[PDB]
Amino acid sequence: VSAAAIFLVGATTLFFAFTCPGLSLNVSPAVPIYNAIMFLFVLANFSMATFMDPGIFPRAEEDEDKEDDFRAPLYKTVEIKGIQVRMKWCATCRFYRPPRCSHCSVCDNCVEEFDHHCPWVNNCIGRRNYRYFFLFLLSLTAHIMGVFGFGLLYVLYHIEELSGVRTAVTMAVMCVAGLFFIPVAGLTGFHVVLVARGRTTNEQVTGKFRGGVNPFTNGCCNNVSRVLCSSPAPRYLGRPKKEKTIVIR
Amino acid sequence: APVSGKVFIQRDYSSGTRCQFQTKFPAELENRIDRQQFEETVRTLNNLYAEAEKLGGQSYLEGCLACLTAYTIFLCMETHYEKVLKKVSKYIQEQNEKIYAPQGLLLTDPIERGLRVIEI
Ligand SMILES: [Zn+2]
Ligand SMILES: [Zn+2]
């Protein structure tokens, strides 16, 4: 099957067991704020991004939409903001795929507003979990930056000898941070660009949009507002089923 | 309980991706439902969903509170959109029991359809 990134937690716990207990008698007193809160935020955001419905559409059954399709090329055009977008008559999901969403192929589902699929996240990112994943990445890169830039006190104040005992605990986490920071920083900066622009991932892959493009570009601050402080969407699948009222004549 | 057919209302897209339906009255519903009351109900339902979306100060505050409390406030308290869905569900039930039922029509919650098309 597929597995998560266990090693990333393993690097963090080096700081949790023995890295800086009882050093704050003459130096920086306030210990936990540097790493503990960041680790809790990272864990919470990562978990809520991993186990959560990202926007699975409820597998539109047959006899859906209009059946007058005789030999249509399976795409109807809608002009949002005056700019046309080409959507698709999805075969198995059996609906028109409203603009800015697609299939997931390997995930075997067709979803709402789509960003990317990955085995590390174990799913595909819609918009329900896009805020959670975005804060997870921001908090994780913040955690790595905080480690590599300030948690090195346990060596930086430590004189030449640094002889064993507990120093070897910090020995490996330094190179772990060094090797892991560049990819995560680049990827989170990528997603920062994708948030600044109203334009994400597969839209980067499409090397065709040249001109009056990105109809839903909005206004930058508005995009960060809707991705951070908007009211979370509810799940489109698994809602309790209601009951009929009457024969209705 | 015989059934004649189903009519779908596409979502209004000139405004954008926000959850408002195409208010334009379909031609199939002639003499079953008048244009005026259909306009009225679609406008009110769209207003309700727009109210569910508004980026007001309360949305910012609830986002900040959720971020601070590690989102456990969702488990204790339902989100704003969920209570708006409850209110609009009550709205559609009362509308169905007061206008559509004598006219031989019934409306389903679009949330069952994934907020794509409303089925009558
Ligand atoms: Zn699909
Ligand atoms: Zn997926």
For residue B76, tell me if it sits in a domain. Answer: yes
| Cα(B11)–Cα(B19) distance, integer angstroms | 7
C-alpha closest to that of B53 among B91, B15, B25, B22: B15
Is there a contact between A98 and B11 if contact means CB atoms under 8 Å apart? yes
For residue B1, tell me if it sits in a domain. Answer: no
| Cα(A113)–Cα(A191) distance, integer angstroms | 15
Given a contact cutoff of 8 angstroms between Cβ atoms, the answer to whether A57 and A236 are in contact is yes
Best residue in B10, B13, B14 for a mutation probing chain A (most A CBs within 10 Å): B13
C-alpha closest to that of B86 among B42, B52, B120: B52
For residue A160, tell me if it sits in a domain. Answer: yes
A62 torsion bin: left (phi>0), alpha (psi -120 to 50), beta (else):
beta
For residue B70, tell me if it sits in a domain. Answer: yes
For residue B114, tell me if it sits in a domain. Answer: yes
A108 torsion bin: left (phi>0), alpha (psi -120 to 50), beta (else):
left
Coil vs helix vs strand at A117: strand
Residues of A in contact with B115 (CB under 8 A): 236
| Cα(A161)–Cα(B97) distance, integer angstroms | 83
For residue B97, tell me if it sits in a domain. Answer: yes
C-alpha closest to that of B119 among B86, B94, B96: B96
Q: What is the DSSP letter of B111?
A: G
For residue A206, tell me if it sits in a domain. Answer: yes
| Contacts of residue A213, Cβ cutoff 8 Å, sequence gap at least 6 | A83
Check chain A for breaks (C–N over 2.5 Å) and list the residue before each, or none.
Answer: none
**Per-residue b/e over B80-105, b at no fewer than 16 CB within 10 Å?**
bbbebbeebeeebeebbeebbbeeeb
How many beta carbons lie within 10 A of that of residue A18, not counting itself?
13
| Cα(B40)–Cα(B48) distance, integer angstroms | 12
| Cα(A159)–Cα(A24) distance, integer angstroms | 17
| Cα(A120)–Cα(A2) distance, integer angstroms | 8
User: Which residue of the set A118, A124, A220, A229 is catalytic?
Assistant: A118
Q: What domain count does chain A have? A: 1
Given a contact cutoff of 8 angstroms between Cβ atoms, the answer to whether B67 and A44 are in contact is no
For residue A67, tell me if it sits in a domain. Answer: yes
Q: Which residue has the tokens 């896009």?
A: A130
Shortest CB distance from B79 goes to which of A60, A112, A232? A232
Q: By the CB < 8 Å criterion, does B11 face chain A?
A: yes
* HSE, side-chain direction, 13 A CA sphere, residue A25: 3
Cα torsion B100, B4, B48, A243 to 10°: value is 80
User: Measured in angstroms, how far is the CA atom of residue A195 from the centroid of ligand 2?
Assistant: 20
Q: By the CB < 8 Å criterion, does B55 face chain A?
A: yes
